[PDB]
Design a protein around this ligand. Structure first.
Ligand SMILES: [K+]
Ligand SMILES: [K+]
Ligand SMILES: [K+]
Ligand SMILES: [Mg+2]
Ligand SMILES: [Mg+2]
Ligand SMILES: [Mg+2]
Ligand SMILES: [Mg+2]
Ligand SMILES: [Mg+2]
Ligand SMILES: [Mg+2]
Ligand SMILES: [Mg+2]
Ligand SMILES: [Mg+2]
Ligand SMILES: [Mg+2]
Ligand SMILES: [Mg+2]
Ligand SMILES: [Mg+2]
Ligand SMILES: [Mg+2]
Ligand SMILES: [Mg+2]
Ligand SMILES: [Mg+2]
Ligand SMILES: [Mg+2]
Ligand SMILES: [Mg+2]
Ligand SMILES: [Mg+2]
Ligand SMILES: [Mg+2]
Ligand SMILES: [Mg+2]
Ligand SMILES: [Mg+2]
Ligand SMILES: [Mg+2]
Ligand SMILES: [Mg+2]
Ligand SMILES: [Zn+2]
Lengths: 222, 71, 83, 83, 129, 134, 99, 25, 222
RNA sequence: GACGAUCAGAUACCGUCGUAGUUCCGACCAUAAACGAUGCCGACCGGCGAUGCGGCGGCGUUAUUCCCAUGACCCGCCGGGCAGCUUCCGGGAAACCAAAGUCUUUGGGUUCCGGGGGGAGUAUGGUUGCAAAGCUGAAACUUAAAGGAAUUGACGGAAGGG
RNA sequence: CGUAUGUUCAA
């Protein structure tokens, strides 16, 4: 069924690449939603945050289109947010789900103050900005749960975060910007230099050179 | 910007005291004029005598005769 | 990230820019990891070993990726010290 | 240039930079040995002199104040002093 | 005028750090600056630095290792008691796993964790993480 | 109002690339060719395509055009490759250099070791165009 | 919304610039804001220049030119089509139109 | 109403009010 | 050149660079190209340092050789003065050339007809070929460029300081790059001069073509 | 203000006159979209071409008749300034801004000042002023928006092309 | 040269 068009999609289907983190490690642009479905197909859960109609004024009247905000993610270190606007509600939701999968980022989880057990919270205080909305993720004591509005609480649970204090500033009624700001906060957990990431990086082989021979054999024909 | 020196507690206290008069929620409850002008005089309820029955025309974009009484 | 025990609990360990030492994020599509092959001392011909440098998108945007790579090569001996 | 060596800038770089903005401030002025065509004795004159320096006894003008370095009188040879 | 040499120094380091520079010139220099820099050095947030003598306040050149997220000063130097130290940590540091609050105490200039160990409160100077 | 729509033009350019050799400057012959090498559902459309083909052929025969034609192709390869001069333009008996790069070549330890002549440096450094409007 | 960085005028490092009167309507306009146009043209138009040539008493008499400096207020400059409205980015262009 | 003329309206109103009190004092 | 005598600049190369005018840059200097110049001439012309030209040229060659599949290297020249030089390089090294107009979306539009995913990009001029350099920024594409003294270095990882303006110098620089790539690969001998003439990469304007073809024609007839 | 036009009216726009004023001197007045609608002092943070002032350096041209210096020009550097272009520095609701940046990773110092729209800069008391007014400055009551920036349309007695 | 206006609510 799935005929990949990109080299990354080709390697994923040929089972040459294992785990999304190898793609994440080299920050490769994913361009096929089947790659996401290949690695996390069973565990992903989707939710329609909001169906927001938008209108364009024309001579004959108002051209109403529907925008769908979809949050995707397995409840374990991966979450994605997708926004799609189209004439039909059903078409908008499907397109948003595709865009949500393409946008999935890895979520770094840390420890409040113990380092006992698996990670339960954000590694540190992270802030996300989208328009006027500022969402600040705060590390929380184990057993605290997620103290946030219903909108970021869905994303934070989908990110796998179990405990988190939060602080929102701006027009949080703008659910599109509110959700995006939360997603931006979650995204930059792995962009934050904690001293445990200080140790010199060891460079591994890029998938485009590690399987450069397989790509020549197959992707040239396919 | 605002002063931050370690010996500016009086200036910060004085400024917040002055600027607290500029929100109507505080000035309503702390000037006394509002309580003097309040027909209930700071009470939740009040008794009275019906002087007459009057009809009030509802504001646009509605249309109706709201039934009221002068008390 | 390791717990008190020392088991690695991070999903993965992101790369860091070879010049600015900033973490290269999962969506930093302007980042590169360019390999510079090392020649044989006498032949001057690719022997199969390469030096690896990673540059974050921000350094490339500033236009500083040129001197970062050049300075890294001089440190690695790829470029002659009398450049 | 991200990696600029601030400890050891080139002498050309320091010579261009403003005297106060150098790594360690130093004057751009100097003292000089002025010999008027007459007599034989030597006069020590500041480069950026503000007063009309007279060769005492000879009673001749050696330099004229300006907005910067003093202008030596015509026929007067000067040599920079060293400390 | 310049009311706080430490504020000027920490801001200058913070700006060069964000700009990806490898070295930053710090002027003027003070014992409080050098002691503050040493606290960051002992934790690896900065490399070696060389104080430069000009028969004046002094200049410093710090080698930056690309590890600082932010080195900020706190003005004014509030008095910090040991009981109130925790509430300062929750307000100034991203997490307890890393980041330090630099205190000037009678024992000497030290980070917040060393002050807790030596049971000494003091006046807050700044922070870094 | 005789501008030809994309459908007339797309058919005509393609026919000349595909069957250039069998075409010519006569509308009447080209009209007949289109009847067998193409399926043109209407006669009027056929005469319009053959009209543009005839117009193109003249142009494709007096120069290259958007359309490709082997004969013009095989010449492009010949200029791009075949003209390698007998002696390179770089092979010059005397190479003129200014004392500035001559002293540079001294740093290159290649100054006096080459066959090159030094010109007198330019005087006045009047190299900037005068500033002003227009 | 600010429309022009220079506020529509050439005043940058001073407080007050003396006004001048518009050539058409005599409106007071600051000298730095007036749309100026230095007009140089022959006294005789190109149609009549030939007739004056053989009507002249000199063998080679060069026709004197007319030098008039016009100052226009914004309304008169726009109305007389000396200047026109331009797009957001076209406004920023400052070079005079080509000759 | 233009703010400048609303100001002029009130200035005239004030002048009338001051004349009304200068007549009663 | 790794301070190796086998990779040092020969007297033959010096005469080639001097003849083609590669050492002469523009009258304007980019602040990030300052390290490559030697001295400004008395006529405002900046002189490029040939050692630094050679070092970056070999450093670029080492980057090209590191790509296992030569087809994964893309060579581009929007300007005509360099279209012939690039296609030859692609014929001699097996790179994928794009001469002429670069259609936007080539590296980013997965469903575009000419969609391609090179592992390394080489361009003739950052100003003229600004589209591939800017577009490479979306797909993690390292970039090599021929940069003059007044050339921007944004998204340019290996800049070769050379006169990328004159017809001779542009062709010569691609010729030297192609020769050095093959020598490192071992395709051609190093002590034996290359069979390909430098003039084969030189762009020839039409006026010269008809001028020389009739000169050759009159030579043959008599 | 008078008048002549224009108009349904025209206490206006247009035109003909024309008082105060406009001008100088001396005393008041203290307000302006008094605007960069952007406090001041200090530090840091990209690039580029200019520009004005000062100084320093350097082929050459020109006058100073030759020399000398000095000016005019040319190529740079430094410092203080009015600005300009560019930039994914970074910021911002955006327009934009190299400051309006170095802000949830929130603290250099310090002054003034705003807290939904009105009522209202009104009343009233004080004070200043010859006056006009300036400064200080409320309340009752009323109201679910008022407003900013930007988008698409529609419209225009706006422009350009059909 | 020279003209003004368009009852209330309602997609
Ligand atoms: K200047
Ligand atoms: K509009
Ligand atoms: K109604
Ligand atoms: Mg309130
Ligand atoms: Mg009603
Ligand atoms: Mg109703
Ligand atoms: Mg407007
Ligand atoms: Mg503007
Ligand atoms: Mg103007
Ligand atoms: Mg009348
Ligand atoms: Mg008159
Ligand atoms: Mg005022
Ligand atoms: Mg003014
Ligand atoms: Mg104001
Ligand atoms: Mg003052
Ligand atoms: Mg000046
Ligand atoms: Mg604040
Ligand atoms: Mg209010
Ligand atoms: Mg009053
Ligand atoms: Mg309502
Ligand atoms: Mg307003
Ligand atoms: Mg009416
Ligand atoms: Mg009606
Ligand atoms: Mg109506
Ligand atoms: Mg209806
Ligand atoms: Zn006018």
């Amino acid at each position: 069924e799935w005929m990949p068009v990109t080299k990354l999609g080709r390697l994923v289907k040929d089972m040459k690449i294992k785990s999304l983190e190898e793609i994440y490690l080299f920050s490769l642009p994913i361009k096929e939603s089947e790659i996401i479905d290949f690695f996390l197909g069973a565990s992903l859960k989707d939710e329609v945050l909001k169906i927001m109609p938008v209108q364009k004024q024309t001579r004959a009247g108002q051209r109403t289109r529907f925008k769908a905000f979809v949050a995707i993610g397995d409840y374990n270190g991966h979450v994605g947010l997708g926004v799609k606007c189209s004439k039909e509600v059903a078409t908008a939701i499907r397109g948003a789900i595709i865009l949500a999968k393409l946008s999935i980022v890895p979520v770094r989880r840390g420890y409040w103050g113990n380092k006992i057990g698996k990670p339960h919270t954000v590694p540190c205080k992270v802030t996300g900005r989208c328009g006027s909305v500022l969402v600040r993720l705060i590390p929380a004591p184990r057993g605290t749960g997620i103290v946030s509005a219903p909108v970021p609480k869905k994303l934070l649970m989908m990110a796998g975060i179990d405990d988190c204090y939060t602080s929102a500033r701006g027009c949080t009624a703008t659910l599109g910007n509110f959700a995006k700001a939360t997603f931006d906060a979650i995204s930059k957990t792995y962009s934050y230099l904690t001293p445990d990431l200080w140790k010199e990086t060891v460079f591994t082989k890029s998938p485009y050179q590690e399987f450069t021979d397989h790509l020549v054999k197959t992707h040239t024909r396919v | 910007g605002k002063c931050r020196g370690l010996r500016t507690a009086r200036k910060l206290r004085s400024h917040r005291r002055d600027q607290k008069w500029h929100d109507k929620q505080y000035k309503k409850a702390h000037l006394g004029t509002a309580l003097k002008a309040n027909p209930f005089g700071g009470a939740s309820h009040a008794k009275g005598i019906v002087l007459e029955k009057v009809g009030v025309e509802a504001k646009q974009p509605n249309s109706a005769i709201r039934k009221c009484v002068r008390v | 990230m390791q717990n008190d025990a020392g088991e690695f609990v991070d999903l993965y360990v992101p790369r860091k820019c070879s010049a600015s030492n900033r973490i290269i994020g999962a969506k930093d599509h302007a980042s590169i990891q360019m390999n510079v092959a090392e020649v044989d001392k006498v032949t001057g011909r690719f022997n199969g070993q390469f030096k690896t440098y990673a540059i974050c998108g921000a350094i490339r945007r500033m236009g500083e990726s040129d001197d970062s790579i050049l300075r890294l090569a001089k440190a690695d001996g790829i470029v002659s010290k009398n450049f | 240039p991200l990696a600029k060596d601030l400890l050891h800038p080139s002498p050309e770089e320091e010579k261009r930079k403003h005297k106060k903005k150098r790594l360690v401030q130093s004057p751009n002025s100097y003292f000089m040995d002025v010999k008027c065509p007459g007599c034989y004795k030597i006069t020590t004159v500041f480069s950026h002199a503000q007063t009309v320096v007279l060769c005492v006894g000879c009673s001749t003008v050696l330099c004229q104040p300006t907005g910067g370095k003093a202008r030596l009188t015509e026929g007067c040879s000067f040599r920079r002093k060293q400390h | 005028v310049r009311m706080n040499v430490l504020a000027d120094a920490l801001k200058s380091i913070n700006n060069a750090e964000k700009r990806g520079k490898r070295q930053v010139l710090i002027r003027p220099c003070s014992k409080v600056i050098v002691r503050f820099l040493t606290v960051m050095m002992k934790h690896g947030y900065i490399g070696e630095f060389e104080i430069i003598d000009d028969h004046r306040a002094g200049k410093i050149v710090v080698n930056l290792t690309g590890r600082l997220n932010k080195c900020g000063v706190i003005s004014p130097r509030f008095d910090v008691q040991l009981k109130d130290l925790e509430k300062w940590q929750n307000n100034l540091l991203p997490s307890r796993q890393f980041g330090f609050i630099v205190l000037t105490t009678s024992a000497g200039i030290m980070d917040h964790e060393e002050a807790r160990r030596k049971h000494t409160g003091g006046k807050i100077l700044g922070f870094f993480f | 109002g005789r501008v030809r729509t994309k459908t007339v033009k797309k058919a005509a350019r393609v026919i000349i690339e595909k069957y250039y050799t069998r075409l010519g400057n006569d509308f009447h012959t080209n009209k007949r060719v289109c009847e067998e090498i193409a399926i043109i559902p209407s006669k009027k459309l056929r005469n319009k395509i053959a009209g543009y083909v005839t117009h193109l052929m003249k142009r494709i025969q007096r120069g290259p055009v958007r359309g490709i034609s082997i004969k013009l192709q095989e010449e492009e390869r010949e200029r791009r490759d075949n003209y390698v001069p007998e002696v390179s333009a770089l092979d010059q008996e005397i190479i003129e250099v200014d004392p500035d790069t001559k002293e540079m070549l001294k740093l290159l330890d290649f100054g006096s070791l080459s066959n090159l002549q030094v010109t007198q440096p330019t005087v006045g450094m009047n190299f900037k165009t005068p500033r002003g409007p227009v | 919304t600010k429309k022009r960085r220079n506020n529509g005028r050439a005043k940058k490092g001073r407080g007050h610039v003396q006004p001048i009167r518009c050539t058409n309507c005599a409106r007071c306009v600051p000298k730095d804001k007036a749309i100026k146009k230095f007009v140089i043209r022959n006294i005789v138009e190109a149609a009549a220049v030939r007739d004056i040539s053989e009507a002249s008493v000199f063998d080679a008499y060069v026709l004197p030119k007319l030098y008039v400096k016009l100052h226009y207020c914004v309304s008169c400059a726009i109305h007389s089509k000396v200047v026109r409205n331009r797009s957001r980015e076209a406004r920023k262009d400052r070079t005079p139109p080509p000759r | 109403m233009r703010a400048k003329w609303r100001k002029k309206r009130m200035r005239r109103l004030k002048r009338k009010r001051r004349k009304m009190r200068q007549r009663s004092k | 050149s790794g301070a190796l005598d086998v990779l040092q600049m020969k007297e033959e190369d010096v005469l080639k660079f001097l003849a083609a005018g590669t050492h002469l840059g523009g009258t304007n200097l980019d602040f990030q190209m300052e390290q490559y110049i030697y001295k400004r001439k008395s006529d405002g012309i900046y002189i490029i340092n040939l050692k630094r030209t050679w070092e970056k040229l070999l450093l670029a060659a080492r980057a090209i050789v590191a790509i296992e599949n030569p087809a994964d290297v893309s060579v581009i020249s929007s300007r005509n003065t360099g279209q012939r030089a690039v296609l030859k390089f692609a014929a001699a090294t097996g790179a994928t050339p794009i001469a002429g107009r670069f259609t936007p979306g080539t590296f980013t539009n997965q469903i575009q007809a000419a969609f391609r995913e090179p592992r390394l990009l080489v361009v003739t001029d950052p100003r003229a070929d600004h589209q591939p350099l800017t577009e490479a920024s979306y797909v993690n594409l390292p970039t090599i460029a021929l940069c003059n003294t007044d050339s921007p270095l944004r998204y340019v990882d290996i800049a070769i300081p050379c006169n990328n303006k004159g017809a001779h110098s542009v062709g010569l620089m691609w010729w030297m790059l192609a020769r050095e790539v093959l020598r490192m690969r071992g395709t051609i001998s190093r002590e034996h001069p290359w069979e390909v003439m430098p003039d084969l990469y030189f762009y020839r304007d039409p006026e010269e073509i008809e001028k020389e073809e009739q000169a050759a024609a009159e030579k043959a007839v008599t």
